């Protein structure tokens, strides 16, 4: 149960979906949730240990630029806070 | 023939936002060399002696 | 078939007509009709690799001219199992 | 604490960076994340006036370079009673 | 049981045999029909997966364009309707 | 399926990473890894034709800059029944 | 048939695809794969002289581009009876 | 310890230099030494993705200037099951 | 975890700032708060390789200007068991 | 609040006159004085984040010339519970 | 039991334990002591045979100079006498 | 047995066996391996005491380079890891 | 141990003090105390390789500053089987 959180922003559902696929393929990390932000923004949220999350996020960012609209944001959270956890299904 | 890391690193920007990884960016004893008249066989590292800190100690 | 084809478009009308194109071009079953937001609509179909590839290519070639046209059209050959709850 | 630290951004990677910085900087209780519509994501925390100020400063400095970026580094010190039903 | 139908008509039985040989040497396609339309038109009917059918039919077209009088058209259907199947002889 | 794809490279790291791409991009069974000799390493995959070239997809653009690089990526639409003893 | 056909190529990609060309091209049985060394890979087939001749032609023009190219090709109709240990 | 760290070089000198750099710099497991042929030499370690990353950095920065030097240093983020039996 | 990260600085204030950045930067447990003497203060954190690496980099490049400044920043990944007396 | 403010000086008399400024400027209670070694002396005050900031401002502005002078005086509004063992 | 006592001291525990890890990795020797002399002088004390001690201290010098303020003293003793042994914590 | 590892790699085994002769003539080192890397690379493993292995490798690097094509790669290993032993013939 | 350590010098104070260092540094057995004539005096000790190494280190480093000085410092890790009959 690696607490490190990766999460990727995409304009459109496509890049989000292959972003999640790349997340899973690059490393055996778990996805905690996909969200339809609205206005075409779709976001993928995955959990795992810090290094695996970093590798997976890098792979997804690599694989999403060309397909669809591409990336909107991509960054790694190493230690999500307890106060952010209620935003993740309290 | 015989004339790069290939990792999570090659993601250009990537930037999860919170995550940085910004800490990467990377003879005295008792007369070891004093006895350098010593004739034939010796300790130390004249050359081609990898594990003596040269590119090793890092 | 675990092969996953999926198409994004700007408008429900091109989405559903592309779904019909998917279904008549290839004998595959679709699983998702999602409203992304802001007019973006996604369709999710399942089948074997060749069938979904041919179907998606046909739909992409027969969908660009209707409504606002395509937004994206990509397929995944062997999607990860843990992706399943996401759809 | 009664003071309110309260922001939008476009896409919520900078939103979680803002919330994470909220926690890193000062004591603020994350009372609400909300999808305004069209991609605006608003974060809402409660805490001490100075704590809210420092946390919001940090969140603004940490969220703007990521993604589309910040929208408003705004704070209210007294959320008056009639505002609370909107919270 | 391959649902994708590859199927090709040509002028003369020699190009038809070219096409069938290319079918059976190209991919996982099972030839299901060899019929004489009349007036020299001969059609070959094979079944298989979409990718296999595509590759096999294109190989047949390559092997058939020059032999004899040659083919006139190459055609592949991906998700055929079950109603069309009796018209093929089931 | 029984469609046969396979890839070579000058080295074992590009070969094994290409095999990783084979089994990750598409669900194709991996049947062999062979050392030709003098650095030529090949890897053999079987499956659906679309799935076969679907495996080759990721390998081709994953092993080009790894080590000495890709050597050959040609695939077979179908091997003959007596090719297997030589496999 | 005792007629011999056998060809050499750099890398096993052209080797196997040319063996496939031979076994779709004429009545030849692949009696040998040999990793000669230094990337050289050779295929040996029994067969009738006309068949094995057509097969060696097919293998020759199969990998003009496959892999990095041919190395050699020819035909033997009657090897000596004592060359079997070399076979 | 599913992360698969991996090094190639020319000869065992940089190879075992990389190997003991692996096992001494980080607390990870070396699973394999292989001789590709033609001078290319193969070392395979397993461990946590961060631990594997640190180890491979250590070896790649320690073994390049000894002997003929490094050739292929690369690691796998999420290795697939299918390749492991072929290891 | 078994990975040890650890830093000195001149002055206790930068030391605790660095350890604070340790304990929020990544999931890590800190084990040592040692007064070297003459002003050197050492912080010892324990965790897995990726977490300790990221945490140490963040704390170091955040503590460079804090107070008098840091001392050293390099981290070992897989410490030998023999460092038990350092506990 | 929960904020911990810190002061560092070359010697303890400036440090504790700064601590007097701490506890006499704002409603903040100091939890500790620590002699680092080699003359470095730190004082750790506890209280509300705004109070802590104002107190630290006052002490730093008071104690530039006192003794040999200041070294470090920065604050964290939310030091971790994990820092408490270091407190 | 390698009676040879190698030992080195430096500025702070980062270079000290980096040299310790270098000694225990490059050589198979047992370190016996970590001492705070005072004023930054921190010392590592290891036991081993003469060749192993030599290799360990060479590795420590190589890996310790480029970290922190660096190593200071890097000499060893090959055959420590019994009377020094109580000074090693007996 | 002295775990200290000396290994010398050369192009062709004439310099490899010159290095081995320097090994077995210099110090108490036993050659534990004579292996052919592939493509002409020949390398030799000897094991012994740290100083003995160091002196032996010194002699090899003194008498190996100018023999035919000569030395290509040498080194010393001070305290080899336990997990390396499987790669050393187990 | 069959390693031989040897020192030549001009006089006996250098010889005897060098031998005292010889035996004090590590366990080595003095075997030869030979007066060459013409002022040359030599000491030969027996011990294992590392012991002789460090011992002759100490012996030279104690003897250098006596008389005209040490003339030759030399050791062998193992003399041949055929040297000692004329020891």
Curated annotation (Swiss-Prot), chains A, E, K, L:
Q: Where, per UniProt, does this protein localize?
A: Carboxysome
For this UniProt entry, the molecular function terms from Gene Ontology, in alphabetical order, are: structural constituent of carboxysome shell
Keywords for the protein's UniProt record, in alphabetical order: Bacterial microcompartment, Carbon dioxide fixation, Carboxysome, Photosynthesis
CDD domains listed in its UniProt record: BMC_CsoS1
Q: Which GO terms describe its cellular component?
A: carboxysome
| A Pfam family recorded for this sequence | BMC
Biological process (GO), any one: carbon fixation
Q: Boundaries of each BMC domain copy? A: 4-89
| InterPro entries recorded | Bact_microcomp_CS, BMC_dom, BMC_shell, CcmK-like_sf, CcmK/CsoS1_BMC
What does the function comment of this entry state?
A: The major shell protein of the carboxysome, a polyhedral inclusion where RuBisCO (ribulose bisphosphate carboxylase, ccbL-ccbS) is sequestered. Assembles into hexamers which make sheets that form the facets of the polyhedral carboxysome. There are estimated to be 538 CsoS1 hexamers per carboxysome; note this number includes the probable carboxysome shell vertex proteins CsoS4A and CsoS4B.
Comment block on domains: The tight homohexamer forms a small pore which is positively charged.
Q: Subunit composition?
A: Homohexamer with a small central pore. A CsoS1-CsoS1D-CsoS2 complex can be isolated following expression in E.coli. Forms a CsoS2-CsoS1-RuBisCO complex.
Question: What family is it from?
Answer: Belongs to the bacterial microcompartments protein family. CsoS1 subfamily.
In Swiss-Prot or TrEMBL terms, this protein is called Major carboxysome shell protein CsoS1
Q: Which organism is it from?
A: Prochlorococcus marinus subsp. pastoris (strain CCMP1986 / NIES-2087 / MED4)
Curated annotation (Swiss-Prot), chain B:
Q: Spans of the C-repeat repeats?
A: 27-55
Q: Where does the protein end up?
A: Carboxysome
The UniProt PTM text for this protein says:
Unlike H.neapolitanus and predictions for P.marinus strain MIT 9313, this protein is not thought to have ribosomal frameshifting.
The ranges of region (Disordered) come to: 1-20
Could you give the subunit structure recorded for this chain? Answer: Probably interacts with the carboxysome major shell protein CsoS1 via the N-terminal domain. A CsoS1-CsoS1D-CsoS2 complex can be isolated following expression in E.coli. Interacts via its N-terminal repeats with RuBisCO.
What the protein does comes down to: Required for alpha-carboxysome (Cb) assembly, mediates interaction between RuBisCO and the Cb shell. The protein is probably highly flexible. The C-terminal repeats act as the encapsulation signal to target proteins to the Cb; they are necessary and sufficient to target both CsoS2 and foreign proteins to the Cb. The N-terminal repeats of this protein bind simultaneously to both subunits of RuBisCO. Probably also interacts with the major shell proteins (CsoS1); that interaction would increase the local concentration of CsoS2 so that it can condense RuBisCO and full carboxysomes can be formed.
Q: What does the domain comment read?
A: Has 3 domains; the N-terminal domain has 4 short repeats, the central region has 6 longer repeats. The C-terminal domain has 2 repeats and a highly conserved C-terminal peptide. The C-repeats serve as the encapsulation signal for the alpha-carboxysome, and are able to target foreign proteins to this organelle.
Family to which the UniProt record says this protein belongs: Belongs to the CsoS2 family.
Name assigned to this protein: Carboxysome assembly protein CsoS2
Q: Upper taxonomic classification of the species? A: Bacteria, Bacillati, Cyanobacteriota, Cyanophyceae, Synechococcales
